[PDB]
Each structure stands twice: as structure tokens, then as C-alpha cells.
Symmetry: C4
Subunit: 223 residues, 4 copies
């Protein structure tokens, strides 16, 4: 479509001004998005992102959440760079077990050649990496979206730093001609991106607020 | 076609009412189907299923049976799930030796996405597996058949249980809109599926009633 | 085309009756075909066959022979069955080194399904194998030829025997409808195939009559 | 196009007669081309060649050179023969790390069958190899160029010798019908190729005249 809202797990997720939101939009979530005490962005999620480091404990929890009718997730995307020095073999191991998991690099992240070369050089020769928030923005750019509203990204309120996250965002702004907006006025991110021009979150009860663990025999068969 | 009869090795195979059979149909057999003392379903078989656990002793016996003109088999199908934790490597080893063996998962079982995801989750996180009877029904559904007549399935008269076999059958009934019928009135299976609305088996003599074993040197070259 | 002459290294190669040869034909040779003391079949060869067991010492000798203008070879074919228990890995090793070598099984021998299944079963369960003469006939059948004139095959004047070579030839006669002829009246092969209905070989001088050996350092780099 | 100038790192690179150059042409460079004290051939390079033996220290240096706006390189080509005994695995390792590196053999050098067979035989059975200058000429021939002007090739002023470099050049002259020219009258190469029928290089200041080395932790992650 045209508009998409990407959200992180920062402390500014609860300070969203709902007068700046567009009419039609999609929501992207990642990692421990189910720790919310309120439904800040509803229960409809276009896509979710899980890192290869912890994936078995996340798929099980997502299955349990979807079984109890708490969220309506459409896609599951693995946040892998397919680089030989970090997660090349683990991505193959994960993909050999599941069939409904979409690999991010092969499908969306490989279509940005300059950004891919930049990231690979910085990973190989400088030991620097981007967070999940920039990964979601890159995937949204690669999927055709043009308006990206950022929230919940507080810029870390040793690979990850603030000189690579800000430099990568400016790289995508200059090379692919997309618009970035901030919907949290008090967030430090608003100092770099313009506020757009001009609803109480319902409470959650008896919800799951911890990551579930698979039984003991699950690890035995994988080892 | 439209109708197909799937048969197991249960004790109710000899108690079939032949007034309920349709006009044109195909027969599916599996495992030690040649231990019959009578020709309950004739000598024409559309397809046969062999598990990867014991396959070398089965192909040899099937070759000997077909050489002596006792059965007329058309296809041989390997009952493999292609899951890394059970039979992923053994299936490749078997397929590297024979060229006339059809892999079930790649050809028929991979076209049912929801059923495949359900089975993979239950295998990975709960240690539960389905029997060959449900595998044959799933393959028949995936091959275009609409009427499936079950027989010889007595529901086990530790992976296999009666809460996964019955749950999988209901899953296929709800999701793919197929009809299941039981042709053994005294079988416990008739309590869950309707009896359809309204011939002596010839005796077998000097037949093979035991699984044949390859010579000793066959195992040496494989090890 | 239509006619092809296949020749072995037997003692009946020097007893060919040249009145029975057709007008236009092709010649197939194999193994140590350059040990002839006379040019029995000329110096034009359509294809040559080398076994994977000894191939490095044969390619070098063939290169030296072609450099000195003694034979005019068109194709080089590797006589591999691609079976995991005999020469599966060695064929890949050979093909990784040379680019002008044609693999026989992948190109010609895989298009005869019944013959392939028969050979694989006999190899796996009975320890029986065919010689190069039957391999050349099968390849000629698979390449479209219809008239095959056999010579130099004296039927061994422990895998190889006379109950598999004769049984394989009858298998190809019955299943693919080809004509076999013998051009050596005194050969024992004429007792099984009909003689067709109704030229001094030039001498060879200062020729190569032994298989050449590569230098010592060639084996070091391969080990 | 039609014309291309290939240059080496010999001592005759500074003795080029600029009256013999054509109007429109492309320049090929290789290895330590950035050690020039003057801009002999400008700062525009169509393609560059790096050997697999030292590649990590070259990509980093090329990136630093391009960042400082000293050269304008278009393509980077890996000079690999894809032969199992020299650089088959190292080429795969290099290609698994970078995405903007073009493999020479797969793209350009595999389209010359006779030359490839000649090179493979000489490598396998005689321990002889060609230099980078002949590799660049072969790639230029395979890319459609017809006029090739050689410079900086002083013919080594133990695999490499002067009986393989001269024999390979004559092989390409006879088999592919291309024209070779020499633009350095005093070079020994002019004795074998005709001089064509009938500008001060600017000085370089504060330039990089040594190969840069990656940090210590780069080697740790690769080992």
C-alpha cells in the first residue's frame, strides 16, 4: 500500500499521539511485542519479525497466543542477513524445520544492492550491525511502501550503536526517496524527522507476559 | 477418479460387507499386505506404501511376489515426512539407490499446507505421529479422490495414539470437504463415520507368508 | 543414423569378413583399442569409452595419440553407472577435472527405464555387472541406431559372466526392437545371432603399444 | 566496443608512445595498479582483476581509494580458474562474502572451449600456468572486443614461463581471429607483434603507495 507504522519495544510506545495517524495503514511488530499492558496499536499485525538467536521459544509462544485469540498475525519473517560469519547455518537449520517462515534476506533485503553492499562491508571490516527497527524499515521500503511512521524507537535509551542506526536511515532516505515520520513528540527521534501535520488503549487482562519454554525433550532431539 | 478403498492390516479386514462397495474403485495397500490367507480385495493394487524403517527387505519381497504372478502393483510410494529429526537422510539414501520409487511428501503430501504445518508442529513440540492409514487417506485426498472407503483400521486393537489419528481425520474432513465411509459394520470406526446406503474371497495356496531376507553380503556393501 | 559397428578387444577382431559390412556405418571402440597391429576398422572413430577405474592414464595416452595424427576421435564417453556402491563419487571427481568428457548414464543410459531398473536390481541384490560391450550396445540403442554389428566380443574367451551378458542382450532385443548381427563367422557369438546376407588391413609401424604413465608429481597433487 | 588497452605493472608502462593510441578505448588494470607515480592512463578504469591469493587486503584498499576520489572503477573481477587443485574452494569462500564481485571463469572464460581444455590439460599434466596479462586478454576476447593494445607486459623482465605466455597468445590469435598491437616500441613484446601506424602524465601527490592491512580481529572471525 502507501502507509505503514513500524513500532519498537521502547518506553515511548505509550506516548503516541493518535491525531497524527493516517487513515489506512499496516503495523509491524518484532521480538517481545506481547509484553504490552495495553492494546496500543490494536490486535491486527501485518508481519512479525523473530531473530535467529531465539526462535524455537518464540514460535511456540506465538502459536499459543494465536490459539487463545489474542492477536491476528498474517506473516512470520526471519530476520537473517545470510552472512557466513553470523547466522548462515542457523538460518538453514531453522528453515529445514518450518515451512511457513519467510526468510527476510532472500525475499526482500536482497533487492537493495547498494544497501546490502554497505551492510556487508560494515559487518566484515568494522564489526557493526543494525537493530531490528532498521531491518523492518528496509523491508517496508523493499515491499513498496512509501510512508513509514516510526514509533517505539528510543535509540537505546557492542555492535549496535547510534552512529550506524542514524547513518543507515539517512542512506535509505537519500538513495530510495522515501518519507519518514515520527508520531512520538517527546521521543529523541523527533529531532531528526519532522512531525506530521494534524483514543484510549484498552487494558489487557490475564494475558501472557513472559516467554514460554518448550519441554525438556525438545532440546534432546535437536542435539 | 472418484472412489478409492484404503485397507489396513487389522482383524476387521475379513469382515467386509461386499454389498456396500461402489462400482468402480481403486485399492491402496501398505506394509505386510501379502500375509492374507484369502484374496479379500483381489490381486489388483493401485499403489503400495513402504516405510523407510524397513525398505530393502520389502522391495526384494515385492519383486519376488511380482515375478511369481501373485499381485499386479502399479506404483510404489515411500512413506516419508522429510523431517530432519526422523527420516530425512534415510529417504535420500533410499532414493539414491532406486529410480522407480515415488517419494510421498515431495509429490502429494506437500500440497496440503495447513495439514503439513499441523503435522510438523505436533511432531516437533509434542512427539506425536500418525499411522500409515492416515497417510494413505491424505495422499488419496491430495490425488483428487473424493470418496474414501476405510477398512482394516481397528484403531490399535508411543508416538501413535487414538487422539491424533481421530483428530487428523477430522482435520481433513473440515478443511478439504471429502467424504469418509466405513465398510466394516462391526468395526469401532463405524461409530464415527456413517455406513453407506445399500462374494466369497478365494483361498490362497503355497503363498509367501513371511518377509524375505536379503543375502549377507548385501549388508556389507551398505556398511 | 541407421548402422553402427561395435568392436571389442577379443581375438576374433582379426577374423572379420569384409563382404558383410554395410555401406555407411560408425565405429565404436573402448579401452585399449590402440594395441592393434593392423588398422582393422580404419582410423575414424565416432566415440570411445573409458572406465572410471583407470582414466587419467587413458586421457593422457589418447591426447598423445591424437597429437601424432594416428586416430581421429570425435567424442569421449565415461562408462559410469552412477551407482552409489561402485563409482558414484569417482565419476564426480573425474567430471570436476575435465569439461570435454561426456557422462554415459546421464546422457544416454538414463533414457531406458526398464533396463536401468533391471541393472540396478541385479547390481544391488545379486552382485552381477555387465561388460563394456553391452554398455556400448545400450548407448547405441539409446542414440537412435537400429542396426548394430557386433565384433571382437568372444564372451570371455567375478561379477561378469555369460548368463548376464546374454540375458541383457535378449532384454534389449525384446523390449526395444533392434537388430543384432555378427560379422565374425567363427566367433561363438554367431551361434546366437544371424549372419547378414552377402580388404586387407594396413600394417602399423612405430606405433604406441603400451599405456603411458603420467609423471610422479601428478599423483601427489591428487592426494 | 572495438578497442581496449590492457596494461601490466612492468617497467615499460612509463615508456608509452601516445601517438599510437586510438580515439575511443577502455583500460584494464590488475593487482597493484595504484603504485603509479603518475597518471599514465588516466583515472577511468573499465574493470579490475584481483587474484584469489590476496583478496581481502585488496578490496579494502580499493574501497579506501574509491572513497577518496582517486579512481573511478566500474567492475571488479575475480581471476579464478575454478580448478579443483588450485582455487576452487577459495573462490567459493570469497563469493560467499561479497555480492558485487564477478567471477571470471563462470562469466567470460568458460565460453572459450578449446582454450579452456588446453589450459586445463597443461595445468593438470605439466604444472604450467598463465599470468594475469593473458587472463585479461582472454576475457577481453570473450567480451567481444576486437582490437587489443598491450602495454606494461615485459615478459618477466615456477609455473609461469615465457613458453606458455607466448604459446597461449598465438593460440588465441589463430583460433579467434583477433588483432594484437604493442604501444611500447622499446619493449621486447614489439618483436612479436606489429607497431600500429601513426601528452604528459600528471603527477600524483599524497597518494597511497602501499597495500593496506585489515585490523587484527578480521582474521580471527575468518578462522
Amino acid at each position: 500500500p502507501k502507509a505503514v507504522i513500524v513500532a519498537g519495544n521502547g518506553e515511548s510506545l505509550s506516548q503516541i499521539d493518535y491525531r497524527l495517524l493516517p487513515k489506512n495503514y499496516d503495523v509491524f511488530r518484532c521480538n517481545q511485542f506481547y509484553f504490552e499492558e495495553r492494546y496500543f496499536l490494536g490486535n491486527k499485525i501485518k508481519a512479525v519479525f523473530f531473530t535467529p538467536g531465539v526462535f524455537l521459544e518464540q514460535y511456540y509462544t506465538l502459536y499459543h497466543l494465536k490459539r487463545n485469540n489474542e492477536y491476528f498475525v498474517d506473516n512470520v519473517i526471519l530476520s537473517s542477513f545470510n552472512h557466513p560469519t553470523v547466522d548462515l547455518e542457523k538460518s538453514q537449520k531453522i528453515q529445514a524445520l518450518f515451512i511457513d517462515v519467510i526468510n527476510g534476506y532472500e525475499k526482500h533485503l536482497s533487492k537493495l544492492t547498494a544497501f546490502d553492499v554497505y551492510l556487508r562491508y560494515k559487518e566484515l571490516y568494522e564489526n557493526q550491525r543494525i537493530t531490528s527497527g532498521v531491518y523492518m524499515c528496509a523491508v517496508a521500503i523493499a515491499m513498496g511502501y512509501t510512508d513509514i511512521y516510526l514509533t517505539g524507537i528510543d535509540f537505546y535509551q557492542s555492535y549496535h550503536s547510534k552512529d550506524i542506526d542514524l547513518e543507515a536511515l539517512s542512506f535509505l532516505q537519500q538513495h530510495y526517496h522515501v518519507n519518514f515520520y515520527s508520531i512520538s513528540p517527546m521521543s529523541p527521534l523527533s529531532k531528526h524527522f519532522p512531525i506530521p501535520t494534524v483514543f484510549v488503549a484498552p487494558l489487557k487482562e490475564n494475558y501472557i507476559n513472559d516467554i514460554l519454554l518448550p519441554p525438556h525433550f525438545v532440546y534432546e532431539k535437536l542435539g
